Nucleic acid binder design. Structure first.
Ligand SMILES: [K+]
Ligand SMILES: [Mg+2]
Ligand SMILES: [Mg+2]
Ligand SMILES: [Mg+2]
Ligand SMILES: [Mg+2]
Ligand SMILES: [Mg+2]
Ligand SMILES: [Mg+2]
Ligand SMILES: [Mg+2]
Ligand SMILES: [Mg+2]
Ligand SMILES: [Mg+2]
Ligand SMILES: [Mg+2]
Ligand SMILES: [Mg+2]
Ligand SMILES: [Mg+2]
Ligand SMILES: [Mg+2]
Ligand SMILES: [Mg+2]
Ligand SMILES: [Mg+2]
Ligand SMILES: [Mg+2]
Ligand SMILES: [Mg+2]
Ligand SMILES: [Mg+2]
Ligand SMILES: [Mg+2]
Ligand SMILES: [Mg+2]
Ligand SMILES: [Mg+2]
Ligand SMILES: [Mg+2]
Ligand SMILES: [Mg+2]
Lengths: 303, 101, 201, 53
RNA sequence: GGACCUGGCGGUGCUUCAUAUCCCUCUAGAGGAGCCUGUUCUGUAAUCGAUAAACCCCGAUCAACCUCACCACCUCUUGCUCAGCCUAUAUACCGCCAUCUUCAGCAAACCCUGAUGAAGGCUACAAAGUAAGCGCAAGUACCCACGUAAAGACGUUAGGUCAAGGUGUAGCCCAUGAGGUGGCAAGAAAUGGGCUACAUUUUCUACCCCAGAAAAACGAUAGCCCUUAUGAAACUUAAGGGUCGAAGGUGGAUUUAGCAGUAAACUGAGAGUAGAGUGCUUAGUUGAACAGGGCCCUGAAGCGCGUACACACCGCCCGUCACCCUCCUCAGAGGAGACAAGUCGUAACAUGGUAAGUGUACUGGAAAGUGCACUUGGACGAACC
């Protein structure tokens, strides 16, 4: 109700001034971010669910959009579609149908607002079928080769929806290099790829052929350079820790590929991404669950 | 007014063990070494046997302090699993929370 | 799977990316444009762009693997290939000039041809009924038959590289218990021919 | 004697026929999707009226 | 007794599904050996509880004494307690949970339909449903927005726990209470789970992955002896060492788990103990194969159909054979009804597993079977397919 909301708004302004005074800041320039930071400092709450933590937002945000009365003192509703029970939605559909009728008589990065957004706009509950009907009508409107007024009206309902390259640096001698990091399983690696070299890769100061006796891991190291046709065209120094041999090999591969992106062309970078050299493998160990042998191996069902 | 006769017996055992710990430690020091004469060690053995039965530390059982449960007692809190679950679930134990990972 | 369904499997083929734009069709151009907006699964640690990557041999190694001992499986596979090549070289040298033309020496070709010869054409399924076998099932049956025959206890103290090389050469020449097993499957299918109508597909 | 040497042709025909059967299965499955669902939707708009309004 | 409603059930119809799940398909196991351990049976003077899924390395993240509630003997009586009881009742309960649930439904309060009956409330090119709330969802922890956790309402199985503790009821009160000493705990026999193996993708050594030897040995964590750790107490527990080199040679039906960093294999840590698990929780490494057909087999959903069931098919129920009564006809015996349990079958109720029944005839332990005709008091799924 208006009286309650006005009292809340005035109380919130007064409390905002008190909070600014308590934090020793200008009451006038005190902003919502300042209010939030001050409240967080004054009432520290580690509850994970942010909505649970203390909050002193404006009453407009705090309280829901409780709808106003629809009929006056005489009992006569205001909207002629009132008795439809969904006056806002049906009036919107009526307007869309009228626009389509007018169009017929005279003759990319944006999605459609979800049913939740439409409900928020219409302050009315909706069914998926009603929302689908409305969206189909909007699609017909847009396809009808409408005018600018209709397009801007539709914009009320429309909703707008590559790898990043590390910067090249220069060593003491000024020779160029790039740096990157990657992780795989528990392994973490950081790679420095120089612009010129004989393909020599030193992991933890040890040459790769000695650090990775396994030809599989050596192939994993080879994979990026072979992909971009640069076998022997660079030297690399990598530092890795954690995980096993294969995890370390994968992490070093990822770090080296990310660093090499600093040198290879953008087409080569995109091709590497499409080949999967620049995606951190999210696959990690799955925790054992109580009452079962492993992540998924249940105990032998007894009979 | 302890929870039960078993808890009362354990309390008696703890009191007796605390009373006789120093004497037990002294007499057992002689036995648990290979320096003193074997005859002295044997007389020490018979003496430590002669000490009252309840003084033996091995007879102290870690029962829950609130319900006298003889098993499933978490040492850090001295509470049976049931009572610990009750209090933790009601949120009356600092820090402890339902684990999810 | 930790990957969301949006993630797409990686395509590891240098030629596919080096292909000129002009040779691309409109469908291919659209696919390449779309892939620039899709997420790509991290390339598995198994397959790479090495020209010496043989997916058939990689799958055979995976099948031979026991308890995640990929290193030992790879060692056995490479030992088998080396033994096959060495036997071929010995036969080549011991053979006359004419037979040297016939004597193959490429272990990869020998392996592929042996598995192809061991692939069964018609299978049996409970419905038992003779039925066609899809190509994937044919290849898997060939590989599994080869590995099981090599693992048979009948061979005493003989190492897996030698056993598998001998069986592979026998299969390449259309002999051995693996080909006998394929013939047995074919014979059982022929015997149950009359029941082919029981199949509803 | 169940030897592929001469059977090559018949075996190839068998494989081709199996591939054709699978392709026809796929084509029929995709082509199948007036269907009962659409027909019943049409009928519901004009229900039979065995009673009086 | 006739007709309906709801639900359960159907060896019930059609359709669509099961994504580690119903079958085939893939991987690794169990079922064959030894050992560890739980349960049952035996034994003893010697617990108790769980005990189909949803019991069986379960209460116990733990028994030499204690723990212990069991047994034998002994001792005390206002007793640690303004007593006590591990005495019966989980079919009185709280408390915490299994279970479908790997579900998305439960819904108060209204309104309407059925002539104002039990009951029902569905059609989006919409035809009486609206629903606060709970759940799902959303949100949250872990490493994403993924996945795994967590969560998972109302109800079912009077599911488990009176032995976590409390409590109603009933019960002992010189004992069914309290204390002490000592004691079981083994295996005729079976059975579940786990571990170790049966080896050559193996074994020993070095290293921790470019080696050398073994190879009829492989194979015990088993047995016996000794030592050590803890402990007042060790054949009892554990570790080590010695000694022994056993069974067995990938295992029938059948059966378990798994959709990816998963299975499989391997290595740690922790809880709890003075000590103690091949057990539990948890961290990490290497790291697979199939993933496609289907609905002849099991369950799920939707629409249906039938129903003599409603403690809801583990239901209901028919007839004979034997057993006590009451009545009727009968030279003594039969019939009926009732009471009532067994017995053999499963005839009927679902397509009741051969649809049911009428008449009639033959046959048969017994419901009954079949023959010929007749009824629907059965269906044939209701466009073409
Ligand atoms: K077995
Ligand atoms: Mg103890
Ligand atoms: Mg399964
Ligand atoms: Mg066994
Ligand atoms: Mg028992
Ligand atoms: Mg019992
Ligand atoms: Mg005793
Ligand atoms: Mg005892
Ligand atoms: Mg008692
Ligand atoms: Mg109960
Ligand atoms: Mg449960
Ligand atoms: Mg869970
Ligand atoms: Mg949720
Ligand atoms: Mg009960
Ligand atoms: Mg019980
Ligand atoms: Mg007594
Ligand atoms: Mg031994
Ligand atoms: Mg000692
Ligand atoms: Mg030996
Ligand atoms: Mg019957
Ligand atoms: Mg019948
Ligand atoms: Mg008849
Ligand atoms: Mg007859
Ligand atoms: Mg007639």
């Amino acid at each position: 109700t208006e009286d309650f909301i006005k009292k809340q708004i005035e109380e919130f302004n007064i409390g905002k001034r008190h909070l600014a005074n308590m934090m020793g800041e200008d009451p006038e320039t005190f902003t919502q971010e300042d209010i939030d930071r001050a409240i967080a400092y004054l009432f520290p709450s580690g509850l994970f669910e942010k909505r649970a933590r203390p909050v002193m937002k404006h009453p407009e945000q705090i309280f829901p959009r409780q709808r106003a009365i629809q009929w006056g003192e005489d009992g006569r509703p205001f909207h002629y579609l009132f008795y439809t029970g969904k006056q806002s939605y049906y009036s919107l559909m009526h307007d869309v149908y009228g626009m389509l009728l007018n169009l017929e008589k005279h003759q990319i990065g944006s999605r459609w607002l979800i049913k939740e957004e439409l409900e928020e706009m219409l302050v009315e509950k909706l069914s998926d079928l009603d929302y689908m009907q409305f969206i189909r009508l909007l699609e017909k409107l847009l396809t009808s080769q409408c005018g600018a007024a209709e397009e801007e009206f539709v914009q009320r309902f429309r909703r707008s929806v590559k790898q990043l390259i590390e910067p090249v640096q220069y060593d003491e001698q000024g020779m160029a290099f790039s740096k990157s990091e990657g992780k795989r399983k528990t392994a973490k690696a950081e790679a420095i790829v120089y612009k010129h070299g004989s393909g020599r890769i030193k992991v933890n100061g040890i040459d790769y052929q000695l650090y990775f006796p396994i030809t599989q891991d050596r192939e994993q190291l080879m994979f990026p350079f072979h992909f971009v046709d640069r076998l022997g065209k660079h030297d690399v120094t990598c530092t890795v820790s954690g995980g096993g041999r294969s995890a370390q090999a994968g992490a070093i591969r990822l770090a080296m590929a990310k660093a090499l992106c600093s040198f290879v062309t953008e087409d080569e970078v995109e091709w590497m991404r499409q080949a999967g050299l620049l995606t951190t493998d999210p696959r990690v160990r799955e925790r054992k669950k109580p009452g079962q042998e492993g992540a998924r191996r249940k105990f032998t069902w007894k009979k | 007014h302890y929870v039960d006769w078993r808890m009362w017996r354990d309390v008696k055992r703890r009191k007796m063990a605390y009373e006789y710990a120093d004497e037990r430690l002294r007499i057992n020091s002689l036995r648990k070494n290979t320096i003193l004469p074997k005859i002295l060690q044997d007389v020490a053995d018979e003496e430590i046997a002669a000490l009252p039965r309840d003084s033996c530390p091995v007879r102290i059982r870690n029962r829950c302090v609130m319900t006298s449960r003889p098993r499933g007692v978490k040492r850090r809190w001295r509470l049976s699993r049931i009572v610990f679950r009750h209090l933790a679930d009601h949120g009356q134990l600092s820090g402890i929370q339902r684990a999810t990972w | 799977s930790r990957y969301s369904p949006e993630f797409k499997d990686p395509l590891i083929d240098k030629e596919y990316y080096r292909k000129p734009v002009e040779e691309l069709t409109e469908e291919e151009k659209y696919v390449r444009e779309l892939k620039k907006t899709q997420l790509i699964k991290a390339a598995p640690a198994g397959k790479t762009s090495s020209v010496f990557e043989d997916p058939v041999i990689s799958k055979f190694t995976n099948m031979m693997m026991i308890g995640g001992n990929k290193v030992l499986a790879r060692s056995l596979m490479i030992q088998t290939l080396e033994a096959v090549k060495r036997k071929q070289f010995e036969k080549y040298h011991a053979a006359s000039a004419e037979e040297q033309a016939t004597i193959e020496r490429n272990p990869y070709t020998i392996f592929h041809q042996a598995l192809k010869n061991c692939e069964p054409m018609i299978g049996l399924v409970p419905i038992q009924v003779p039925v066609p076998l899809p190509d994937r099932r044919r290849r898997f049956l060939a590989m599994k038959w080869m590995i099981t025959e090599c693992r048979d206890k009948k061979h005493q103290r003989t190492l897996m590289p030698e056993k598998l090389s001998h069986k592979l050469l026998e299969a390449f020449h259309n002999q051995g218990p693996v080909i006998k097993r394929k013939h047995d499957l074919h014979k059982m299918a022929e015997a149950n021919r009359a029941l082919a109508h029981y199949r509803w597909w | 004697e169940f030897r592929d040497d001469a059977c090559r042709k018949e075996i190839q025909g068998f494989l081709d026929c199996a591939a054709r059967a699978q392709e026809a299965r796929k084509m029929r499955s995709i082509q199948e999707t007036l269907l009962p669902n659409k027909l019943n939707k049409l009928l519901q708009r004009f229900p039979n009226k065995p009673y009086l309004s």
